Amino acid sequence: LDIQRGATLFNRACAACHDTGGNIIQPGATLFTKDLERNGVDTEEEIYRVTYFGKGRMPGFGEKCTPRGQCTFGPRLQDEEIKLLAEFVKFQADQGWPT
């Protein structure tokens, strides 16, 4: 994957909530491997799905995310952007979110 492009997109679309792989809103639902595993989402395909459709307090970002209330009120992300993000998150989680 394009690490730098992924990092740039993550840093503007995700980082304020998932700061350095964390979760400033919801303890226990970080992007670290152990939390992803406990939540049943430690795969690229599952990370993509939750990014696309959202879950609870997390908005989803997909073009076809529905209904409006469960999705970002900002611009939707393209499929290719969400794929890049899912690959980036999986890679970072595998690496332990290096600083």
Binding stretches for ligand HEC (CB under 6 A): 13-14, 17-18, 23, 25-26, 29-31, 35-36, 39, 41, 47, 50-51, 55-58, 61, 85, 89
Q: CB-wise, 56 or 96, nearer to ligand HEC? A: 56
Token couple for 46: 């599952």
User: Distance from CA of residue 19 to its chain's centroid?
Assistant: 11
Q: Give min distance, CB of 95 to ligand HEC, in A.
A: 15
Q: At what angle do helices 44-53 and 79-95 cross, to 10 degrees?
A: 130
Q: CB-wise, 61 or 71, nearer to ligand HEC? A: 61
80, 2 contact by CB (below 8 A): no
